[PDB]
Amino acid sequence: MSRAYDLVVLGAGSGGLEAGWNAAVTHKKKVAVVDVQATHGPPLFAALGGTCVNVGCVPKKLMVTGAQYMDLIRESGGFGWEMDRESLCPNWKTLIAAKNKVVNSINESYKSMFADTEGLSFHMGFGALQDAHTVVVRKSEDPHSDVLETLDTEYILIATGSWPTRLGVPGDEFCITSNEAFYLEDAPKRMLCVGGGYIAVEFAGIFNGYKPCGGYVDLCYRGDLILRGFDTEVRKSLTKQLGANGIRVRTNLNPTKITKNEDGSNHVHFNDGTEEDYDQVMLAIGRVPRSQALQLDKAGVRTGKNGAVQVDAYSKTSVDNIYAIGDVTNRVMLTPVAINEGAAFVETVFGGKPRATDHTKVACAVFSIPPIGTCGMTEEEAAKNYETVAVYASSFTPLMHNISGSKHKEFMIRIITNESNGEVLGVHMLGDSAPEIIQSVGICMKMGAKISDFHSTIGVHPTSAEELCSMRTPAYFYESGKRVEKLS
Amino acid sequence: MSRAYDLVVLGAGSGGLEAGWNAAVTHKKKVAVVDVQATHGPPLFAALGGTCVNVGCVPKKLMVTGAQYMDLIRESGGFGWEMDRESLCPNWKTLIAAKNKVVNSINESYKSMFADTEGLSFHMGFGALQDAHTVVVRKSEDPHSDVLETLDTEYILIATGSWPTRLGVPGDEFCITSNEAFYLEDAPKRMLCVGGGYIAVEFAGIFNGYKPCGGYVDLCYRGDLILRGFDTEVRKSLTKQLGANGIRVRTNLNPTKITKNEDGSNHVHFNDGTEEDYDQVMLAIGRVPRSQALQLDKAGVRTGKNGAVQVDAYSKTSVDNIYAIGDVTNRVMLTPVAINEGAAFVETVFGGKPRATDHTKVACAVFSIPPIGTCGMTEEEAAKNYETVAVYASSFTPLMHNISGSKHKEFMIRIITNESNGEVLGVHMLGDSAPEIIQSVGICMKMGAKISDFHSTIGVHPTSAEELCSMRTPAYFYESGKRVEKLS
Ligand SMILES: Cc1cc2nc3c(=O)[nH]c(=O)nc-3n(C[C@H](O)[C@H](O)[C@H](O)COP(=O)(O)OP(=O)(O)OC[C@H]3O[C@@H](n4cnc5c(N)ncnc54)[C@H](O)[C@@H]3O)c2cc1C
Ligand SMILES: Cc1cc2nc3c(=O)[nH]c(=O)nc-3n(C[C@H](O)[C@H](O)[C@H](O)COP(=O)(O)OP(=O)(O)OC[C@H]3O[C@@H](n4cnc5c(N)ncnc54)[C@H](O)[C@@H]3O)c2cc1C
Ligand SMILES: CCN(CC)CCOC(=O)c1ccc(NCCC(=O)c2ccc([N+](=O)[O-])cc2)cc1
Ligand SMILES: CCN(CC)CCOC(=O)c1ccc(NCCC(=O)c2ccc([N+](=O)[O-])cc2)cc1
C-alpha cells in the first residue's frame, strides 16, 4: 500500500507546480512533477512554470509594457520633451531578446528549486494515466512511443492546462497563435488579429505598438462587440480608444480562405467577401482544455464538454484519488485561481482540514492599450439574477491628458449594486492603473462591501481611484426586468 | 433677524468652496464666498478654487507627471525604443505654459459656476470679522485699507487655509516656496530644496526631472531621515531611490546665511559650515494656518498653537454660529478631508441631521519620484498604542525593471496588524501605482478589515497590487513594548 510517490502532478503549471511545492515543503510528501520542457522553447511551447510564465501572462505583460512606451514617448511632448519624432518606430529584436532572457531566468529559477527541495522531483515527458495509481511518462505525446518512467503513486493531480483553439477552415495551417507570436522573427507590418478574446485585444495592442514604420493592425471579431462577458459600456469605450490608437476594429467578419503569396505574406478571404494581405493572421479564438492525450478513459476519469475534466468544488474527479485544477477543469481559466485551486487541494488532501476555492467575485484585468479592471457582476447578469439593481457610472478624462493631447483616454468607472441592500455586486473600470486599483476593490467585494462604504471612505485628491468614493446618485436602475427609474 | 446672506465663506478653498455650493444647491441658502483672486496669478498666489487647484495638488501633479517622463524615456531603451539619447533635457517653458493653461481653465470653470448657480455669490477681497454676524471685505490684507463690501450673515465659515512657513535667518528673503516655484522663469540648474516634508520631496523630484543639462538637485533636511510620520522602512527605501535618481540627499544639515552673487545666483552657508551656490533655495518647511489677518479676537473666536482655529468634531468654533475647516483648523491638512469637513458642516447646520468627519484611517499619498501610498498606523505608533502587534512586509522588484534597467525601483508593502484580532491597522506602500492602490485599500480599512480578508481574496497575476493578498507570515512583532518574536 506504499507507492513510490505520494502525489504525481501532470504539468508544472502555475496551479500544478504550486500544489507540488506546497505538499513537499509544508507537509513533506514525496512529490513528482511532470512537464514537457526545462526552458521556454518553441517546439512544445509551455514548460516548467506553466503557460503563464512561458507563453502567457508574464511575457505578454512585458510586451504590453513595451508597446505602452509608444504612447508615453508621444505624450511627453506636451510636457516639454523634445526629441526625434520622425520615423521613431521600435526594435522587436531587442524586445523579444530581453523578454526571453527574463523568462529564461525564471525557468532557471525552477531548476534550482527542485534541486534544493526535499523530495520534490521533476520528470520531463508526456504524462498519461495507465490506471488510478500509475502514471506513464512517454517521450512523445504519441501513445505508441518509448516509455521513460512509470510513476507509482497514491494520488494524481491533473494540471495540464489548456491549448489554443483553431478555426476549422482552408488556409488554417498558415496562421499563428499567442504561442508562436512570442517567438516571431520580426515585427509584422501588416497584422491581422482574429477573435475578440482578451488575448486578441492585448496582442493587437502589442503588434500595434511594435509595428514598423508605415504598418497597421486589424482586429477581426466574429460578432458585434469585442470582449463578451465584460461591462458593455467598457467594451464600447475600449473599441473606441483602440480606434484612436490605430487598431482598425472590424466586426461581424471572419476569414474563410487563406493562401500564401510568393513573397511569404498571406492572402485572406473574409465573410463579407473582401480580400487583403497580412504578414500574419493570429488566431485568438480562445483556449480548449488539454486532456486530449492523457487517456482519462483508461483510469475511469470522465470529461464533459470538449475535454474539461469533471470535478467538484474540492477539485476531486470521477475517481476518489485523482484530482484536477486550473485551465483543464474549465472553471475560471486564470492563474491566481489555478494557484488557489491547487493550494486548497493540499489543505484538502494532505492538510487534513479541507477547503474549496471561492469562484465568485474574482477580480481580473485586461492589459489592453488602455487596460480594464473588473470584479463581479455586469448589468446584463445582475439585472437578471436580482430584484432591484442600481447602476452607478462616472466617466472622466484625467487632468494630465489635457497637456499630453491624448484626450481620447477617458477613465471610466461603473459600480453595479443591488438597490435592496446597497451591496456592490460588480465594479468595472477602464483606464490606466485599473488593474492595480481593482485588486484592492476585489478585497472590498470579498468582504461583501456596500456602496455606502465606498463613498463614505475619504479620498486621495489626485488619483483616478478616488472617483470610486464620489459615486452616490445612481445613473439608472433595472427593476426586476428592463431599464427604468425609481417606481413605487 | 434676517441677514442678507445665510452663510459667508472666507476662502473659495477646496473645503470652503464645496460648502458654499452644497448649501446653495441642495438646501437653497443665500451664500457668499470671499477670495483674493479670480485666476491663479502670482502676487497673491491662491485663488478661486483654493491652494489645491491653483498652487498645489493639481499643478504639482502635472509637473510630477512631466518629470516622470525622464525616467520613462530612459527606461524604454530596454524594450527597444532607440532615439536621441545625448543631451535630451526637457523644456520648462512648455511645461509651465501648458500647466497654466490647465489651471487657468479651471478658474474659468468656477467663474461660470457662480454665474449659473442659484444665490451663490463671489466677492473678491480680504475677509475680516467685524463681529459674529458681520464680515468686512477690504481690498488690502492691511486692516487700514478701503472697504469694498460689508456682508451681513447668520453664519460664518472660515476656510482660509494655510501659508508657507519661513525659516527665520539672515538671507531668508532671497529664497522661494512652493508658491513661487510654480511660476519660475526657467528650470534651475543648481537647485536646493530645504526641508523634508512631502512638498520638498515632490518638488525635489520635479526640479530633478526638469533640470537642464549638467545640472543637479540637493535636498536638505534638518533631522536624520526625510518624511517624519511615514513608515520608517518606506522612508529609508525612498531616500535610497532618490539617491539612485540623482537627488543628493543631505541630513542633519540646514542653512543659516544666504547672500546673492553678482550673476543673480545665491550663495549658501550651512550647519556643518560648508558653502555652495544654488540658483534657488526653496523652503518646504511646512505650512502655518492662515488666520493671522482675519481678526478672530474681535468676534470672540479663539486660536490655539500658532493660529489654528479652535474647533470641535462638528467644526464649530469658540462662537456658536461661526465654523472653520481644512488647513486653517490644523486637523489633517489635505483636500479631500477639508472637502468632507465642509460637506459635513452643510449636513450639520443646513441639513438638519448632523455628522462629524472621520479623521482616522485617512489614506493619502506622496507623489515622489517613486510615489508612496499610506493609510493608518505605523509600527512606531501601533506598537505603542496596542497590546500585541504583528508586522508583515514584502519588498520586490517588478518583472519589467529587469528589462528597463532601473533595478533600484523596489516595490515595497508592509501591513501592520493587531495580532490579538488580526485587524489591519495600517498599510504602507512605496512604488509606481501606490496612490491608486491605497485608495481602495483605505476603503477596506474603513470597513475595519483584517489580514485574513486580505490574503483570502483572489489575486490578479501581473500587478504590484496582488502582493497585498500574498502576505501571511508576519516578518516580526512588537509585544507590548519593543521588537520581538512570538512568546507565550
Ligand atoms: C497569452 C496568455 C495570456 C494570459 N494572461 C493571463 C493574465 O494576465 N492573468 C491571468 O491571471 N491569467 C492569464 N493567462 C492564463 C494562465 O496562463 C492559465 O490560466 C494558468 O497558467 C493555468 O495554470 P494550470 O496549472 O491550469 O496550467 P498551466 O499553467 O497552463 O501549465 C500547464 C503545464 O502542463 C504541461 N503539460 C501539458 N501536457 C502535459 C502532459 N501530458 N504531461 C505533463 N505535462 C503536460 C505544459 O507543458 C504546461 O507547462 C494567460 C494565458 C495565455 C495563453
Ligand atoms: C504644494 C502643495 C501640494 C499639495 N498637494 C496635495 C495632494 O496631493 N493631496 C492632497 O490631498 N492635498 C494636497 N495639498 C493640501 C491642499 O492644498 C489643502 O489641504 C486644501 O486646499 C485645504 O483646503 P481649505 O478649504 O482649507 O483652504 P484652501 O483650499 O487652501 O483655500 C484657501 C483660500 O482662501 C483664500 N483666502 C486666504 N485669506 C483670505 C481672506 N482673508 N479672505 C478671503 N479669502 C482668503 C485663499 O486665496 C485661498 O484661495 C497640497 C498643498 C500644497 C501647498
Ligand atoms: C446562440 C448564440 N449564443 C452563443 C452560443 C450567443 C451568446 O451570447 C453572445 O452574444 C455571445 C457570447 C459569446 C461569444 N463568443 C465569445 C467571443 C470569442 O472569443 C469568440 C470569438 C470567435 C469565435 N469563433 O470560433 O468565430 C468563438 C469565440 C459571442 C457572442
Ligand atoms: C523634542 C524633539 N521632537 C520635536 C519637537 C522630535 C519629535 O520626533 C522627531 O523625530 C521629529 C518629528 C518632526 C520633525 N519635523 C518634521 C519634519 C519637517 O518637515 C520639518 C523640517 C524642518 C523644520 N525646521 O523648521 O528646520 C521643521 C519641520 C523632526 C523630527
Residue numbers in the entry:
A (entry chain A), B (entry chain A): 1 to 488
Quote the original article.
We solved the X-ray structure of L. infantum TR in its oxidized state in complex with compound 3 (LiTR-3) at 3.37 Å resolution. The X-ray structure of the LiTR-compound 3 complex is homo-dimeric and is closely related to the TR-oxidized apo-form. However the Fo-Fc electron density map, allow the identification of the space occupied by the ligand and the residues involved in the binding even if the nitrophenyl group is not completely visible in the structure. In particular, as shown in Fig 8C, compound 3 is bound to the NADPH cavity entrance with an occupancy of 0.8, where it may form several mild electrostatic interactions with the protein residues lining its binding site. An electronic density peak was found close to Gly197, that has been interpreted as belonging to a sulfate ion (with 0.5 occupancy), which establishes electrostatic interactions with Gly197 and compound 3. Compound 3 is lined by Tyr221, Gly197, Asn254, Arg222 and Arg228 a residue which is electrostatically bound to Arg235 (NH1(Arg235)-NH2(Arg228) distance = 3.5 Å). Indeed, the superimposition between TR in oxidized state and the compound 3-TR complex shows that Arg228 and Arg222 undergo a 30° rotation (clockwise and anticlockwise, respectively) to allow compound binding. In particular, the nitro-phenyl group maps to the position of the adenine ring in the NADPH bound TR, and the two arginine residues (Arg222 and Arg228) that in the reduced enzyme interact with the adenine ribose phosphate moiety adopts a completely different conformation in the compound 3-TR complex. As shown by the structural analysis, residues Tyr221 and Asn254, which are involved in ligand binding to TR, are not conserved in hGR, where they are replaced by Ile217 and Gln250, respectively.
